[PDB]
Symmetry: D2
Subunit: 150 residues, 4 copies
């Protein structure tokens, strides 16, 4: 239940561990970033793997009565063969399920995985408990905080 704080430095350390596992870079046609969470990790992977072909898939949700379903705003074409598909984390994997099904032949990776989402991805770096909230660095700032005493 204590939030897990992810600094930019640490995110890049984890992403570089993933990149090393994705060598040799020549096996890949490109990277598909899951917007928005995957954008930064994609940037790091593309740099480390020397990959210039980077595209995106953009999904959002909408409610109708008591239900909630996913909408595709934009997608890279194809079934993902030869691609890495990257998101920042998988939690329960609702979006990851949709993404898997659009790109069934991609290698689908995240930085973080919680237990209920873990089966949906092909690789990930860091295990996080289901009840832990992951605070990513694009959601944070270096900000004054009062001292613990006085």
């Amino acid at each position: 239940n204590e939030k897990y704080v992810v600094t930019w430095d640490m995110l890049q350390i984890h992403a570089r561990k993933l990149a090393q596992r994705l060598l040799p870079a020549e096996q890949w046609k490109g990277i598909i970033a899951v917007s928005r969470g995957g954008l930064v990790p994609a940037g790091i992977l593309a740099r480390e793997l020397g990959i210039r072909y980077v595209d995106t898939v953009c999904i959002s949700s909408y409610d109708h009565d008591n239900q909630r379903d996913l909408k595709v705003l934009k997608r890279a074409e194809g079934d993902g063969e030869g691609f890495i598909v990257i998101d920042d984390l998988v939690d329960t994997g609702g979006t990851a399920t949709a993404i898997r099904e659009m790109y069934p032949k991609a290698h689908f990776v995240t930085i973080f995985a919680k237990p209920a989402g873990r089966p949906l991805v092909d690789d990930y770096v860091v295990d996080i408990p289901q009840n832990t909230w992951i605070e990513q660095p694009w959601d944070m700032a270096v900000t004054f905080v009062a001292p613990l005493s006085g």
Copy 2:
């Protein structure tokens, strides 16, 4: 003209200053990132502006003496109307100008601009001298370094 070190935290400060200028978010259809340098700034803008429609333009460029050859590897469709197109930095403004020919109605922004490129972008945050190399945080690591005195 010692290199200018850009940490992740400072890059985000600069990008947030750009995002504030781009408010209200409702003026924009989406963001196009210039891969690869624009991917991280695009993620930051997309978070700050609440924009899930993020796409890419991927180009390879090679200098042959006084002329650049441009190869488009992948490009987002359309003329850019209603889009922000973001790259990390402009030096000569050559890439910006090429991208702007592809997307002549986009609002083209960077984080850093050297003097030659400043007039060739719609907005930028930080002035950098022409002969200063900018070292971006996706090209760096936190690494041991020997003491200045042994």
Copy 3:
């Protein structure tokens, strides 16, 4: 047992967790830093606890096969009663034990502890395996590093 990289931000998170345990600040007369490793954690504790009385103990230690020779370069007076004495890390606990002989009534704390040293300190925040080297942020820099694939 790959080295464990400690960024400045993460060091401060850990030190704040230590500072919370040391509340209320009124229980303490002051802080003694073990130079040099304890200087940065001491600054953090002094800020968090509102303690302006900060002193140092400076020792040089050289291993000669199986025995250490200790030279006190400078030491804060007294037996440590009412003081926190802070060092960055404990490995064997040899330094801690020596310092504690000098200040037997101090409350001796570190940020990191390897298993051998854990019982030889009053409090610590982070467990580190015995054969893991901790790389502290005062020994590191943000530095260019080549891509994993060229």
Copy 4:
């Protein structure tokens, strides 16, 4: 009037520029840190210069009627000959005046200086306007901040 945010990384970059100017390290007997602001910078200098003799001077203030005066809580002995005395910043230099007078033969340096304090120190790294508040990294945390839009 916009606060000047100092990240840990940037503080160390500035402190290393100062350390380079303080070479050769052999000219110094040791470092005196001005508590509390000087503790972190002292830690960095001591590492970079290979200096193990680090002591402190600790001053506080007290009011009496409409006046305000300084109190010495603890001080290193001597007139500072052969020492570096370091504080994080000089602003108006009230404390710096007292420190100068206690250690008239030290080399008194800071990282930051505002114009009214600048004449009191022997060297500093970064000029800061009088009306700018410097936010040091021991006063900050990496913390959630709401997005600029929505």
